From Swiss-Prot, chain C:
Residue spans crossing the bilayer: none
Phylogenetic classification of the source organism: Viruses, Duplodnaviria, Heunggongvirae, Uroviricota, Caudoviricetes
Protein name per its UniProtKB record: Major capsid protein
Gene name, Swiss-Prot/TrEMBL: gp23
Membership in a protein family: Belongs to the Tevenvirinae major capsid protein family.
Organism: Enterobacteria phage T4
Subunit comment: Homohexamer. Interacts with the portal protein. Interacts with the capsid vertex protein that forms pentamers. Interacts with hoc; one hoc molecule associates with each capsid hexamer. Interacts with soc; this interaction reinforces the capsid structure. A total of 960 subunits of the major capsid protein forms the 160 hexamers.
UniProtKB/Swiss-Prot annotation, chains D, E, F:
InterPro entries: Soc, Soc_sf
Subunit structure: Homotrimer. Interacts with the major capsid protein; three soc molecules associate with each interface between the major capsid protein facets.
Source lineage: Viruses, Duplodnaviria, Heunggongvirae, Uroviricota, Caudoviricetes
The keyword Iron-sulfur is annotated on this UniProt entry: no
Purpose: Capsid decoration protein which helps to stabilize the capsid against extremes of pH and temperature. Once maturation and expansion of the capsid has occured, trimers of soc attach the interfaces between the hexamer of the major capsid protein. Acts as a 'glue' between neighboring hexameric capsomers. Dispensable for the head morphogenesis and phage infection.
Species assigned in the record: Enterobacteria phage T4
Name this protein carries in UniProt: Small outer capsid protein
Stated family: Belongs to the Tevenvirinae Soc family.
Subcellular localization(s) per the UniProt record: Virion
Keywords, comma-separated and alphabetical: Capsid decoration protein, Capsid protein, Virion
Keyword Ribonucleoprotein: no
Signal peptide: none
One Gene Ontology term, aspect cellular component: viral capsid, decoration
Gene that this sequence comes from: soc
Principal location class: virion
Amino acid sequence: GFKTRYGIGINPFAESAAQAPASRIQSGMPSILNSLGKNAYFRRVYVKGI
Amino acid sequence: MNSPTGQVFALRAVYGKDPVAAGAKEAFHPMYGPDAMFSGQGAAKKFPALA
Amino acid sequence: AGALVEIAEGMATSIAELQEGFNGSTDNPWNEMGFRIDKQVIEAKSRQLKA
Amino acid sequence: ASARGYVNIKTFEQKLDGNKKIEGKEVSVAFPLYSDVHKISGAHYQTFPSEKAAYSTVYEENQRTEWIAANEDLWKVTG
Amino acid sequence: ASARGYVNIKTFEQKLDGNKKIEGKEVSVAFPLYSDVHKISGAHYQTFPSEKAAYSTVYEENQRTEWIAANEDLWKVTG
Amino acid sequence: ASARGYVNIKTFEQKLDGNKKIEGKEVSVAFPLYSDVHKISGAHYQTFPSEKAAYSTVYEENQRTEWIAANEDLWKVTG
Amino acid sequence: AEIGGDHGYNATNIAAGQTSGAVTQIGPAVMGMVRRAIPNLIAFDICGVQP
């Protein structure tokens, strides 16, 4: 068997709708609240009719 | 990441005499323009909010 | 419609550390992979003419 | 309880206008609430942390908008 | 609430002696309470951290002796 | 009859939870149908080939979806 | 069965080093600081200056 450990992170300022962040200490692990559909860097667009 | 659990700071430029306050506008924000008169008239008088 | 989204995540180092019966924990096996190796077979057919 | 620390904000009642005041308000705030959001400047206060809140009025870890209404409550004008 | 994190403990009930069971219990403990005192080993659990309680019986930041009653209550053997 | 070989499987029932069982089922399968599709792992069995089926429930060459539904049927949980 | 445990994946419990297991680590390393960049001026060619 194999084992790995990696972990992911969100860019601070990813959301970038936020005046100032809550709590001052905020998990950079992606989640529903901060990381779902809120990340400014990436914009997804479904194409149809091809 | 060599040690578990990295961390990254963030420096907001916040204005209004309270770097931390409820709804203290952020200074240099790509979204949000700088409040037009803050240095200016907005220090002399307080304008009525619009609702 | 964005209702049901699509993800991939890790395993918490509390769960992965004790995995398949460590530290008294139980019922949590690892996932495994095999290989298969199945075969095919062909035949030779004939053909012919006359004068 | 906050279990962390209580930041004690003590405002001093002053005479703002003719027979009027800004009432002197003695309030303790959970530090992790106070460190996140605190509006105090020019509030005529003196602030000390402690491991147990020093005043009867106490704002614990969970208020937020109840404190955010109570942090700008220190500038309230009274008759 | 906890305001930090929950360590969720799910114990599996095992047959122990004649017509007796060690009752499997699902419980959610606040993390800085769980890190300070946690008794579980050989208790046939599977534990996972989470940011909101994943089970019904929840132990907040303040129990201690109430959780120190529950953390070793997982070995109480019901007939 | 399959006329080739029969892989005879005997599964050993167990207590999965409090007053719950995974029903043990003796079964046999035509060797080609077995080698083609067999889902058995972690099922607490023992398996032997024989010229004839050594158990009650017998699957000859053609059942397929009766056995493909049966091999996964060994995990059905009963009280 | 000494367990390594994990930080609770909470943001505080990592920054403190608190850990469910035995060890309480130092802190969350540092990955470096992220500032907010300054917006750009439109300059004054558009409007006469006359110092």
